[PDB]
């Protein structure tokens, strides 16, 4: 979107959305992107964060807290593909890990509108 003077991102009149809503997850590369998981583990600091991209490049995650009673992890994924989450809690995996996550590009686009 165009932002400026404190104005936030919306939207024209004719659809040029530039995403369908296939059966996959869409996240923003480059973006430290949240993701909300149903897992059975409150504590935080008691579990682990840890990712590594598809060709082997860890990424930055970190845990928060999230409201309405929910916990999710967040990371800046840089490759696109199946990425792995390993969470565990005190060196002990936990159930639903290591989360499997969809990463894809949301727009065509490296590093934003630069030559090559």
């Given at each position: 979107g165009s932002s400026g003077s404190s104005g936030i991102p919306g939207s024209p009149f004719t659809a040029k959305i530039t995403?369908?809503?296939?059966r996959c997850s869409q996240v923003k590369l480059g973006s430290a992107a949240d993701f909300l998981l149903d897992i059975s583990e409150t504590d935080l600091s008691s579990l682990t964060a840890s990712i590594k991209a598809p060709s082997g490049r860890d990424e930055p995650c970190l845990l928060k807290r999230l409201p309405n009673n929910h916990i999710g992890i967040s990371f800046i994924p840089r490759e696109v593909g199946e990425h792995l989450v390993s969470i565990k809690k005190n060196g002990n995996h936990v159930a639903n890990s290591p989360v499997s996550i969809m990463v894809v590009q949301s727009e065509i686009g490296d590093s934003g509108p630069s030559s090559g």
């Open positions: 995403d369908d809503s296939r």
